[PDB]
Design an enzyme around this catalytic site. Structure first.
Site, PDB file in Angstrom:
ATOM      1  N   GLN A  71       0.820  -1.203   0.000  1.00 23.71           N
ATOM      2  CA  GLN A  71       0.000   0.000   0.000  1.00 23.71           C
ATOM      3  C   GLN A  71       0.853   1.253   0.000  1.00 23.71           C
ATOM      4  OE1 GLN A  71       0.881  -1.837   2.524  1.00 23.71           O
ATOM      5  NE2 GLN A  71      -0.020  -1.213   4.480  1.00 23.71           N
ATOM      6  N   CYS A  77      -4.465  -0.178   2.872  1.00 23.82           N
ATOM      7  CA  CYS A  77      -4.434  -1.636   2.861  1.00 23.82           C
ATOM      8  C   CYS A  77      -5.672  -2.233   2.198  1.00 23.82           C
ATOM      9  CB  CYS A  77      -4.290  -2.158   4.282  1.00 23.82           C
ATOM     10  SG  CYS A  77      -2.664  -1.930   4.988  1.00 23.82           S
ATOM     11  N   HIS A 248      -4.955  -6.426   7.483  1.00 22.01           N
ATOM     12  CA  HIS A 248      -4.826  -6.945   6.135  1.00 22.01           C
ATOM     13  C   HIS A 248      -6.028  -7.819   5.794  1.00 22.01           C
ATOM     14  CE1 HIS A 248      -0.225  -6.358   5.340  1.00 22.01           C
ATOM     15  NE2 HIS A 248      -0.791  -5.283   5.854  1.00 22.01           N
ATOM     16  N   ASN A 280      -1.914 -14.282   0.400  1.00 22.43           N
ATOM     17  CA  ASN A 280      -1.493 -13.029   1.001  1.00 22.43           C
ATOM     18  C   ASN A 280      -1.107 -12.050  -0.100  1.00 22.43           C
ATOM     19  OD1 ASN A 280       1.274 -11.480   1.937  1.00 22.43           O
ATOM     20  ND2 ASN A 280      -0.450 -11.277   3.356  1.00 22.43           N
ATOM     21  N   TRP A 282       0.343  -9.264  -0.009  1.00 24.23           N
ATOM     22  CA  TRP A 282       1.614  -8.615   0.310  1.00 24.23           C
ATOM     23  C   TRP A 282       2.864  -9.493   0.127  1.00 24.23           C
ATOM     24  CZ3 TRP A 282      -2.911  -7.250   2.481  1.00 24.23           C
ATOM     25  CH2 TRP A 282      -3.183  -5.911   2.630  1.00 24.23           C
TER      26      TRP A 282
END
Length: 345
Positions: A71, A77, A248, A280, A282
């Site tokens: 982000q 997020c 998240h 995930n 990220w």
């Protein structure tokens, strides 16, 4: 034909810029602090750069759409969550990002480029075409809102800029959320489920109810995302003991009843399991518990049999959890039913 947002015709403006050999500059969403902050709010000093000026060989996608997402210093997020889900399904992200290969940079024929991009969103019952220039906020030659791990990848960043245009300015996106974003992205209907307000971890019968519905949504091509509610500011991006991150949201990429073969019944004490696979957004997965690839459960099941059961993964970004654990550790599920009528027209 898809309705142009604010009387802006992508292909007309583009072909103009090409004939004149100039790079598009958007008048309705200019490269200025008014596209960034609310009126009179002091924000960080920013430098708007074009992708060429950020990293040579700029691409919409480096390889494929789902590289890690961040982000940024001032990004949101929830938008990363929403992009992750959107990236799940070719049919969907290819709706928001039209003619992606017509937009993508090409080293050959460089005079294709014109600093201009266009995306589709679902607002008030119709597909709007949002036009933007590709200049983005920068501080130390680094994107400060959403971007990917590959510093010459821009699809997430540009989709964001367009989404911010629709909201009015970047700072507005602080008010948005993953649920509404998925509706704006797919044309469907969102439904949230609050696990701690439902006590699904402490029920089983409703938990089965919920699970069957999710089997239904996902099997119908809907989108699901699971988040952990960061309540306080101190909660934001705190790691849990089991490895998941407060604040998240994780994109569900499979929901499945698995049948285990005889002989496993000794260890597992069940023949059927309600399972979820998440990504995930990220980066590499974080989950520690049962069915993490480092768990006793994963190691008790041969690769041959995981393959037969369908408990596989595309990469280290994905990870499996039992739905019991999902209800034990997540706080909310977003459930965005896709509506097919809205795609075909």
């Amino acid at each position: 034909c898809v309705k142009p947002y604010e009387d802006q015709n992508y292909s007309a403006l583009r072909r103009d810029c090409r004939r004149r050999k100039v790079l598009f500059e958007d008048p309705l969403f200019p490269a200025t602090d008014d596209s960034l902050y609310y009126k009179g709010t002091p924000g960080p000093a920013v430098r708007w750069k074009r992708p060429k000026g950020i990293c040579e060989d700029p691409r919409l996608f480096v390889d494929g759409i789902s590289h890690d997402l961040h982000q940024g210093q001032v990004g949101n997020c929830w938008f990363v969550a929403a992009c992750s889900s959107l990236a799940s399904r070719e049919s969907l992200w290819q709706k928001v990002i039209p003619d992606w290969k017509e937009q993508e940079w090409d080293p050959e024929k460089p005079n294709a480029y014109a600093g201009i991009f266009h995306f589709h969103f679902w607002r008030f019952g119709e597909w709007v075409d949002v036009v933007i220039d590709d200049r983005l906020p920068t501080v130390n030659n680094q994107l400060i809102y959403c971007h990917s791990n590959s510093r010459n990848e821009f699809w997430c960043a540009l989709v964001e800029k367009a989404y911010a245009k629709l909201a009015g300015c970047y700072q507005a996106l602080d008010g948005g959320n993953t649920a509404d974003a998925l509706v704006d992205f797919t044309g469907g209907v969102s439904e949230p489920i609050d696990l701690t307000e439902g006590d699904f971890a402490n029920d089983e019968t409703k938990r089965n109810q919920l699970f069957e519905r999710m089997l239904k949504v996902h099997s119908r091509g809907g989108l699901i995302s699971a988040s952990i509610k960061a309540v306080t500011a101190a909660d934001m991006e705190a790691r849990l003991a089991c490895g998941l991150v407060k604040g998240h949201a994780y994109a569900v990429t499979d929901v499945r009843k698995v049948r285990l073969g005889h002989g496993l019944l000794a260890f597992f004490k069940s023949e059927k399991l309600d399972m979820i696979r998440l990504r995930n957004p990220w980066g590499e997965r974080e989950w520690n518990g049962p069915w993490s690839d480092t768990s006793e459960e994963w190691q008790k099941v041969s690769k041959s049999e995981r393959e037969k059961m369908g408990v596989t993964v595309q990469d280290d970004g994905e990870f499996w959890m039992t739905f019991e654990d999902v209800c034990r550790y997540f706080t909310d599920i977003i459930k965005c039913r896709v509506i097919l009528e809205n795609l075909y027209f």
